[PDB]
């Protein structure tokens, strides 16, 4: 700085720019690359507030602590003032940041590491990961004294004492002979009485047991749906109305058939079987298609199978991760994508369940973090596509949606549970070779695709990558990414995440080799995970593709959200309208 004499040998950056008074001059004099240096900078404009003295800078430099509000916090801490571990910053998973590090570098945004890029009164404050939480601040040591940016009070786990713990048994055969008191639903809104007028009229023609006497309001499912326990509500005509129980995790994948012969040795595969498939929906109102449910007019009826599909046996070389490549045009007429009208911005994707139905994830249509909240007129679908770039009416169709129905239980804020919505397409869609939906795996049939070696389909358009995975340098597919993915042991899905994931949601993917980013995070969100069954030759979408893990951090495999507990659920929407 001053002593201009000095102003010619070759200055130490401590030398001419701490205890003097240096710009950004001298200090590039004294290291010649501009991003360390501005790396430095960054911390001047912050130590702004640490210009003097010597230690206040030297400290500053450092970057062990934060200055008050932070703005000079270059430290690595994971938990804000409650401990909640914060969320990706250059992401937006799963809130909005306002400002980020491509707004605010100077601040330095790790990963997830505790920040406070808008100079905002909370001081250190970082998005976190809880989707409960948009923004909390961060306890980080002060600079200069024993102190913290802001009081450190962690959510430690409320111990089992004050709370009386029931020993009462979870709820045996999917609440159909549940003989409790209880009288409240997802909402916690109270039931009507079962012989009332509006309940008779529906439930006429609805498939009960008389075995099970109804009893005055309790939560009843005399239809056996095997999602839970639900009751009527008032309001609209037929509609209805989930409850809250503690149900046993009777997953479908560790039922192992009582007629699985013990000779798990050359496996017979379709073999002449003429395996019929049972439609569980009303035609009338349901529609058309599940009788031609699986059926590829260019592959059934030209004994053709797909140039993706000689891999879908498990006994392949040592299973080894094989990258994703461009499928045959026509092999996936079911493809749709949830698309927005203004803008006309790719947002989701999603697979044509039937002739008047539309199936998406319920964390696509329904996601506030991202001020969204899109009505019927604020969606559209596009459909038979091979190519999202280009208008191809011919063959792709856009349209539009009539109503819109969510699935009660709907869990965003923990771990996106129960993602399903059904939306009722507001035109009729004509059957053609580009146009097809898919069957739905019951119960035994899907024990028996994860039973017995199968593997699943996903296909997308790569939507989630540019929604979550914010890495410049993976740019949107134009050609649509189908991925093989087998089924995934329950330990291994369950020990490797720390969120509670429900059993209407599963893995699917290989083992993550060291040192990648997987391969699960690709394709768009609300997309289909398709697996053909041997019997009949056909494919079974056994549910919805959504967020996962795997985008955001190491280690994880493709999160799917089951169907096979919502066709009592579809039926009761149809009726509804099916008068
Ligand atoms: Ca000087
Ligand atoms: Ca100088
Ligand atoms: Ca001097
Ligand atoms: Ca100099
Ligand atoms: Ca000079
Ligand atoms: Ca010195």
């Known amino acids: 700085a001053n002593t201009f004499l000095e102003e010619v040998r070759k200055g130490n950056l401590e030398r001419e720019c701490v205890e003097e008074t240096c710009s950004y001059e001298e200090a590039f004099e004294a290291l010649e690359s501009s991003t360390a240096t501005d790396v430095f900078w960054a911390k001047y404009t912050a130590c702004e507030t640490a210009r003097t003295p010597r230690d206040k800078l030297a400290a500053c430099l450092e970057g062990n602590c934060a200055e008050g509000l ?38 330095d945004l790790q990963e997830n590491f505790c920040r406070n890029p808008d100079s905002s009164t909370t001081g250190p404050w970082c998005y976190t990961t809880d989707p409960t939480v948009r923004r909390q601040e961060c306890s980080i040591p002060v600079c200069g004294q024993d102190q ?20 009462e048994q979870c709820v045996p055969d999917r609440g159909q002979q549940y003989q409790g008191r209880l009288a409240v639903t997802t909402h916690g809104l109270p039931c009507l009485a079962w012989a009332s007028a509006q309940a008779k009229a529906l439930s006429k023609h609805q498939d009960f047991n008389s075995a099970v ?54 496996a017979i595969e379709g073999r002449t079987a003429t395996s019929e498939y049972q439609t569980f929906f009303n035609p009338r109102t349901f529609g058309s298609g599940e009788a031609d449910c699986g059926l590829r007019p260019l592959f059934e009826k030209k004994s053709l199978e797909d140039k993706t599909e000689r891999e879908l046996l498990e006994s392949y070389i040592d299973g080894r991760i094989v990258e994703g490549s461009d499928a045959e045009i026509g092999m996936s007429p079911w493809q749709v994508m949830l698309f927005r009208k203004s803008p006309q911005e790719l947002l989701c994707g999603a697979s044509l369940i039937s002739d008047r139905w539309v199936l998406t994830a319920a964390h696509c249509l329904l996601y506030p973090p991202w001020d969204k909240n899109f009505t019927e007129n604020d969606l559209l679908v596009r459909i038979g596509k091979h190519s999202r770039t280009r208008y191809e009416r011919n063959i792709e169709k856009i349209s539009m949606l009539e109503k819109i129905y ?23 869609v004509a059957f053609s070779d580009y146009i097809h939906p898919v069957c739905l795996p019951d119960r035994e049939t899907a024990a028996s695709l994860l039973q017995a070696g199968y593997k699943g389909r996903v296909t997308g358009w790569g939507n989630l990558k540019e929604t979550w995975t914010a890495n410049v340098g993976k740019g949107q597919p134009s050609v649509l990414q189908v991925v093989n993915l087998p089924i995934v042991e329950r330990p291994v899905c369950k020990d490797s995440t720390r969120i509670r994931i429900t059993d209407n949601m599963f893995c699917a993917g290989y083992k993550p080799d060291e040192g990648k980013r997987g391969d699960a995070c690709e394709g768009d969100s609300g997309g289909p995970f398709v697996m053909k069954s041997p019997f009949n030759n056909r494919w079974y979408q056994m549910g919805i593709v959504s967020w996962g893990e795997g985008c955001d951090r190491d280690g994880k495999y493709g999160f799917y959200t089951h169907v096979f507990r919502l066709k ?5 929407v149809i009726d509804q309208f099916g008068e």
């Open 148 to 167: 913290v940016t802001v009081a450190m009070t962690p959510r430690s786990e409320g111990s089992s004492v004050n709370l009386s713990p029931p020993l």
């Open 568 to 572: 009592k659920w579809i039926q009761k």
């Open 70 to 107: 932070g703005t000079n916090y270059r430290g690595h801490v994971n938990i804000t003032r409650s401990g909640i571990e914060c969320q990706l910053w250059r992401s937006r998973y799963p809130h909005k940041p306002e400002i980020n590090s491509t707004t605010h570098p100077g601040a």
């Open 406 to 428: 969510i699935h009660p239980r709907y869990n965003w804020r923990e771990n996106l549970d129960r993602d399903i919505a059904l939306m009722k397409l507001k035109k009729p």
């Open 213 to 266: 006497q109804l009893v005055e309001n309790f939560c009843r499912n005399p239809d056996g749906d095997e999602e839970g326990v639900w009751c009527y509500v008032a309001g609209k005509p037929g509609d209805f109305g989930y409850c809250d129980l503690n149900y046993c995790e009777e997953a479908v994948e560790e039922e192992t058939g009582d007629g699985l012969d013990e000779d798990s040795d050359r």
